[PDB]
Structure formats: structure tokens, C-alpha cells
Amino acid sequence: EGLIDTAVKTAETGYIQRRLIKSMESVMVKYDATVRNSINQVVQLRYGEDGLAGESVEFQNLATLKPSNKAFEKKFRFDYTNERALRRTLQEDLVKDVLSNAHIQNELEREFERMREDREVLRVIFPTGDSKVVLPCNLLRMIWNAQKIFHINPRLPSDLHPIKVVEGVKELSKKLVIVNGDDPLSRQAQENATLLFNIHLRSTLCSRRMAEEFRLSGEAFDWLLGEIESKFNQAIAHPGEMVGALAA
Amino acid sequence: MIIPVRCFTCGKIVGNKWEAYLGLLQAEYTEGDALDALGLKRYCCRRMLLAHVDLIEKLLNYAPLE
């Protein structure tokens, strides 16, 4: 029985593969960063609905997905009232700045509001609570490498103001571009495409987690941003790659 | 077809023992006794007298002339 099954499979799968290959043999990614065919008919405005190569993508997890409302509040809010916790995490020359200054407090509140919005988007987009998702850059591995290189020693008060993290994330959210162009439609498409990756980046890089579990310093965070941007740039889908044959 | 000259594994000469082996088996001795009577300790050299097939006889049956 097994031998007969193998013989028929060896005869049927070849024809199946041939038909699959002869239907997408001309599809490719043109230099306009879009997938078309020999008739120049657009099949996808971006390869794989994102425009990224399939080689530089790894499984990851969404921390801000499927939490509890009470846990989500005590993990991404960065309470600025308990000065003892700040002294334990941040240095003395930052606790006073984060307390007295109200602009930092407003900025952190806005960050938490954006985080909540991203969590709602993920819930309405990823039903059934599936944390396992595929994204280009493994931020946890990068953070671990930064810790092991710069010798963070996550016991001492680190020197990294939350505003630095916020501005760094905002700039990295601008540098990573997929749909070039200042046109409103171009910006809308860029936001739509690079949406899940930005949500994951914000969820991993926060003001509380960065100062409790990672304790990265300014130089470490700058190196992390550089590494992330370089890896995302390398992860882009190279135009002129026959994706039809690869899919077949 | 014909008894080899040496054991493939060991190397001991076994070609000069086929006739003696047949004679000992014919007289009264058995195989398990004849093998160690000839001087074959290792089990690798004992296959040459047990596994060997004597096909040269059938070949000689087809005498060219007379």
C-alpha cells in the first residue's frame, strides 16, 4: 500500500508542480516596488502586501496582544508618581526631570494612548489571540546583543531618559519607508504597509520596559536603532526578483 | 571458483589447506574439529573453508580436447 501511494504521488505531484509553475512564470517585482506580470497588470501594489523578501523574516511574538486590562496598564504606562521606583531604575539626574517637567508626562501619556490604540488595532486585526507573528527584525535578539556587548548589567540605574526613547522611536518610524513620496495617498499607503512592524516596535520599545527589563543606555539605544534600520533596509524585497517561480 | 590464496580479512595463507581440509573431513573428522586441527584460530579465516564453493570442477568438466 505504501509503495503504491509513493508511486502515484511521484506521478501526480510532478504534474501539479508543472501547472503551478506555468501559471506564474512571468510575475516579478518591477523597480516601481510593485508586483506585475508580462502584461504589466498590477497584481499586488507591494510584494506580499508588505514588500519584504521572504528570507529575512523570523517568527516573533506580540507582547501587547492578548493581555489583561489590568496587566496591560502596569506594563506599558511608566508610572511617574512612585519616585522610589524611578530612583531604582533611572538615575538621580532624571527622576527630578521626569517629575517636575510636565511635558514629559504629557508625552508619556500620549505614548500610552497610542499603545492602547495599537492594541485595539491588533485585536480587531488578529482575532483568536495569535501572538506568533512573522516580522523582519527580531527586536528581542537585538536588545540582548546590545546588552551583551555594551555590558548593561541590569542591576544598576541606567542613564536613558524616556524622551530619548520616544524621539528615537518616532525618528525610526520615519526612516523606515516603503512607499516613497509625500503625497497624501503615498503617506497613507506607507502607514498601512509598515503598520504591524511599527506596532511591534512600539510595543517592545517603551518607557517602562526599557527601564525595567532592558536598562539600555544612550549609546546602546543608538546602536540598537542603527542596527534595526540597517536590518530593515536589507530586508526589503529586491526589485527584479522572480517571485512567481519562488511561490510555485 | 577456486580456493583463494590468502584470507581477505586476516591474510593467512589458506590456499594450501583446501585439500587437507577435504581429506580430514573425509577420514572421520567433522568441520568444527577439522578447522582447529588445521590451525585456524580466528573466525575470519574459517569462512574460506566453509563458505568457499568449488566450481572449478564443473569448469574442468568441459575439457577442450579428449
Partner: protein, 149 residues
């Protein structure tokens, strides 16, 4: 000096969960003064040990008395004094995790140094006072000697 820790211990249980390997066993030892736990893993084959035996474990950052902070490399041809001359079992590893009972407000009171001697693990759990010399990603030794008593 470089003595990161110094204390006498005693063996009280070996491989409680059943000896897994054949040359390594768990040594659930206890202290006598500082009251600290110990899960050292010694090579039972070359250095046999039975229950009730006491030994002087001394975690040192270097083997020299003057403390020159050796780079780390096997150089047997060396005439300099070595602290290993008075120990029957020495090892070399690198601590990789310092867990403790820390909180969000008040500092920790009990730490737990996790050091791996190239595969042989050891957890020096105890108070957070005598473990000040342990920092993640740092080379350390063992320097244990069985006491005849």
C-alpha cells in the same frame, strides 16, 4: 585579594532526583556560618565525595596572591605563585545570571549567583550581603578543598 566569597560547607544530599549522568552529580550542600545554599556539580569520578564531608569553598577572581587579573589562557609554564597549591579541586567558569528577590521599591535581600564551569552549574543562593563581588559576565574560580576534620 580578589576573594569574592569564602565559607565552609558540608554535603547533605547527592543527586536527589536520581543520578542522571555517570561522572557528574548534584551536591545540595549547605553552609555553616553564612547559611547559604549550594548546588555545586563536581566530577565525582576523579574527585569522589560522600555525604557529611566538609570543604572550604573559596570563589576567587584570580589564582594569584597579588591579584594581577590574568587574561585567561592555559599557560602551564608559569613559576608565579598560585592559590591552587592548597586545593584538591579547582575549576574555571563564568557567572551568567544573578537572580534575586528584588522589588520595585526596596532593594533585594537574597541573591542567587548562577555560574557555569563550562557545563558544570552551581547556584550560590543566600543573602545579598556577601555576594557583592559577583557581576554578570565575569570569570571566577572555585578553589575547594575537602576538610579532614
Amino acid at each position: 585579594a580578589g576573594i569574592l566569597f569564602e565559607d565552609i560547607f558540608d554535603v547533605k544530599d547527592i543527586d536527589p532526583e536520581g543520578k542522571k549522568f555517570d561522572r557528574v552529580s548534584r551536591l545540595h550542600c549547605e553552609s555553616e556560618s553564612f547559611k547559604m545554599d549550594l548546588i555545586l556539580d563536581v566530577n565525582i569520578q576523579i574527585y569522589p565525595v560522600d555525604l557529611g564531608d566538609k570543604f572550604r569553598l573559596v570563589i576567587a577572581s584570580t589564582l594569584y596572591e597579588d591579584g594581577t587579573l590574568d587574561d585567561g589562557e592555559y599557560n602551564p609554564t608559569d613559576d608565579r605563585p598560585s592559590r591552587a597549591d592548597q586545593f584538591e579541586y579547582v575549576m574555571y567558569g563564568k557567572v551568567y545570571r544573578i537572580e534575586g528577590d528584588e522589588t520595585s521599591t526596596e532593594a533585594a535581600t537574597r541573591l542567587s549567583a548562577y555560574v557555569s564551569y563550562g557545563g558544570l552549574l552551581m547556584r550560590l543562593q543566600g543573602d545579598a550581603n556577601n555576594l557583592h563581588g559577583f557581576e554578570v559576565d565575569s570569570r571566577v574560580y572555585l578553589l575547594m578543598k575537602k576538610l579532614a576534620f
